[PDB]
Assembly symmetry: none
Homo-oligomer: 243 residues x 4
């Protein structure tokens, strides 16, 4: 159980450009969920623009030691700061959060979490219940770029605006979000020996517009976060993959 | 008690024990976890300046591993083995300074005189010749190092922490740890390749949460793999659950 | 301002200007510094393969100086004059491929339609018939070429860089540059042999240090020698000073 | 302002075999200074043998783009790698460097650099203060080959052992070091239009040992480094000159 899936699709044509692997295995989105959660936050009025609201880290909430303590939506997409996402879902509540996710048609749309643990608002996108496949990531991103999601066009445009931007060889302008996670073991604990990494988003060059998702599931531990390593490998591969 | 494993995890913010398996008071040679206090001694004594200085070169007379015959700075010294770099620090210190520094630290039994009749205190004391330390004493030393509370300059303590190898772990943890490997001494001061042991000691941090740990595994069967790396990989896998 | 000189030098590692003399936005014909983008277009279109392929022969019906009536490959083509080799590349492209390639490059004004009524877009556009570019636009194009950041395959960009002429300079610099020579157009689109101009554009590299440059001299007196080689030799002499 | 000097001397006699020009004009040794600096490095313990120490190029230091990034004393004499020589002098410090050169009696023995620039440890042998004539180069090399220099014979033997080796016509075995530099203009900047090239060393064949130095100072720019061209010309000339 260790693989890598890559799906590259033309937005204009809709046709497959490049597909490696079956691309239908569902795993937790990890922090690629910051893209649909940003859309939900902007639509609900919790998030306002790229700089509003700026929240301060509170003791007792989870964040990396390298994370910045004052976070706005733009920095939220760059750092880990799991508490920022958890504050958004807390302000939504269980019922608004579940209905929002069902309106998105995002993966299995299961944010109830683990049964008997009441962790749907804090862990569902980390491995507690919510899963999504590379083909469904692409399906969601295509709908986001076409303005077709049942969310306000203002919230959709702001979601695209805080997406991290990267430069790829051969003049490809890439907008993408990384995600790092770990498969659960028997007891339901994160397994450091089974990391997985996402890189999803879209890219443009001249007239061409593409949308992609790369997923790599490993069965050996990684010293670095796997998400950034998957992204770097994909940024190097994207000029060859898009021809 | 021929074969055992001990784990001690302590919270910096509260001072309380988070998790303890075993008695954790069995004293054993530090065996290259000693690079943590030796780095502190080096920075304080002026022998070391920063993570890139001094960069010493291996010389043909000095015995070393094949991969250790190169230029080495304090950062590389902590990442790889490079035993000769450690021995160059103690050679510059001398026996009197080295004994006074370790005694001032209260590090284990603070005995770096080596084996009597062999004059190997500067070269083998932390490898099994005299110096021993327990997991609870290692956590005690690490706890004061993190707070800048050892009787040394805060600058030297900060530089020691900065060259510690870093590892990523689930649930936003970042682990700064040093491994160690060796063999238990026999009935009369000699290695016993049937009783290997492994260390992994250090600290781990999230935002507003710091913990200090020491893991010691002593076996009664030989092992192909060095025990240090195996102990580290298992602790990094366990630390998300041992921390809550 | 009929006569002037402009020099722009930019750092790749930082993206910042190192040295600028003059405004550097005056557009003139590239005049065989266009061999750099035309080589890129040639490699990308499959017309050119590598530094030695294809080797085309001059044929008796073709305009050329005495020294250019021989076998020519891309390496020789960038080293020597050989205007007919450039004309053979654009003939194989055709007007619509040539115009789209230059527009895809964003090279200067991207106008290769030539002088209206003369149908010389494929033969004279980069020699003063339509296509113009400024020193800042030369540096911008060369900066992207050096990083493989033009909208072409990294292979074609690498082969374009490999056939650039190389010159050595003091302080361990190696300069990869292309010269250019021509005359300014007059009031009604005709050569003004009293206003010669010279280019020297390219990049220079030391270990871990890359810079991109363009120097353009426009005169108002007829020159003894072609101006390209004179601008080059002066720039090669100046580059150690301008780079620090 | 432009000339070429060549001095060829016998070891068995000390007598001149061939001399073209006056051979007393002093110019900067450039990287023929790598021969005396190698002797200083082995004697001071900074250098150990042909393969130790191996240093790595660090960003911000000067080297040709074609130079290898990992250098030992053998490769040091073959590539340019100005940073390798500069690291050697930095470990000596200003006083040990000047005292070593003074004990060597090398040219004008002036490594203080230009006044006000404090570049004695970085530019003195490139044109900032240190100069040497062809006859002084032969004088130094003759004392190196005889073991006469006031340095350990271990250091002397290792300096000779890393000297580049070339094959010359008519069975001449040549040990030579190349050097390339540029005369300074008014403000002390290197003048590309006034390059100069060294080739110095010794050569052996049957029962004949010769020492030589060739210097060409030009007043027109050189297409390639002058040093290698001077060496190639001298290797062609050496069977006729030693006759």
């Amino acid at each position: 159980q260790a693989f890598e899936c890559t799906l590259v699709t033309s937005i204009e044509t809709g046709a497959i450009i490049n597909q490696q692997g079956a691309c239908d295995q569902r795993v937790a989105p990890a922090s690629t969920f910051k893209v649909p959660l940003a859309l939900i936050g902007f639509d609900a009025g919790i998030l306002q623009d790229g700089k509003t609201p700026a929240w301060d880290w509170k003791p007792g909430t989870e964040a990396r030691a390298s994370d910045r303590k004052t976070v706005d939506p733009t920095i939220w997409e760059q750092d880990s700061v799991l508490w920022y996402s958890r504050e958004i879902t807390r302000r939504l509540g269980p019922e608004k959060f579940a209905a929002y996710v069902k309106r998105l048609g995002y993966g299995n749309a299961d944010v109830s979490g683990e049964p008997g643990k009441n962790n749907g608002l804090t862990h569902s996108w980390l491995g507690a219940s919510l899963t999504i496949s590379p083909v469904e990531q692409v399906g969601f991103l295509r709908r986001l770029l076409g303005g077709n999601l049942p969310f306000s066009r203002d919230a959709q445009a702001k979601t695209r605006a805080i997406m991290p931007v990267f430069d790829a060889p051969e003049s490809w302008a890439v907008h993408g979000k990384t995600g790092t996670g770990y498969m659960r073991d028997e007891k339901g604990n994160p397994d450091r020996n089974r990391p997985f990494g996402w890189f999803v988003g879209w890219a443009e060059r001249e007239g061409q517009h593409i949308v992609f998702a790369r997923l790599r599931v490993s069965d050996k531990p990684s010293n670095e976060p796997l998400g950034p390593a998957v992204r770097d490998a994909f940024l190097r591969d994207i000029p060859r993959l898009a021809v």
